[PDB]
């Protein structure tokens, strides 16, 4: 009875533009999904889908290859659903996350640049030898339940 644990980092960067765009976009931002500490999650990740707000053209943004990121400009923050799909025949084939993109914070001295990061731990129960190999090539660690 083997249990495999893998870690993913979800984060974002946002910066006030020197000059707003013609449509009034005030900020440049990036949202990303990556492995911690030089672990390559491409061994076990097939693709990552970033679901942007309806206001953006073609909101369903797909990264099938690293880097897994979206870089955009805008005027407001929003909740971004994010789907990480696995290189697995069996279930689970995907995991769903939600990421809160925030562009600003209220502060005595204004800050032009912002960055945030979260650590998400994923647990797979009795994977196949092929998928286990994939998770462990990406820095996964196995415990016994």
């Amino acid at each position: 009875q083997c249990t495999v644990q893998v870690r993913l980092e979800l984060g974002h960067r946002a910066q006030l533009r020197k000059k707003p765009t013609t449509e009034g976009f005030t900020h440049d931002w990036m949202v990303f999904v990556r492995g911690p500490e030089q672990c390559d999650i491409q061994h076990f990740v097939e693709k990552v889908v970033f679901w942007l707000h309806d206001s953006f053209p073609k909101p369903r943004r797909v990264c099938k290859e690293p880097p897994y990121k979206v870089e955009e400009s805008g005027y407001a923050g929003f909740i971004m659903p994010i789907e990480v799909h696995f290189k697995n025949k069996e279930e689970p084939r995907k995991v769903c996350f939600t990421y809160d993109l925030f562009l600003n914070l209220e502060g005595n001295p204004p800050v032009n640049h912002l960055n945030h990061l979260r650590c998400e731990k994923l647990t797979f129960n009795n994977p196949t030898t092929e998928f286990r190999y994939k998770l462990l090539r990406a820095g996964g660690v196995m415990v016994m339940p």
Binding site: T26, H53, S55, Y75, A76, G77, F78, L103, N104, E106
Partner: peptide, 4 residues
């Protein structure tokens, strides 16, 4: 502030 600005949210959507």
């Amino acid at each position: 502030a600005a949210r959507k």
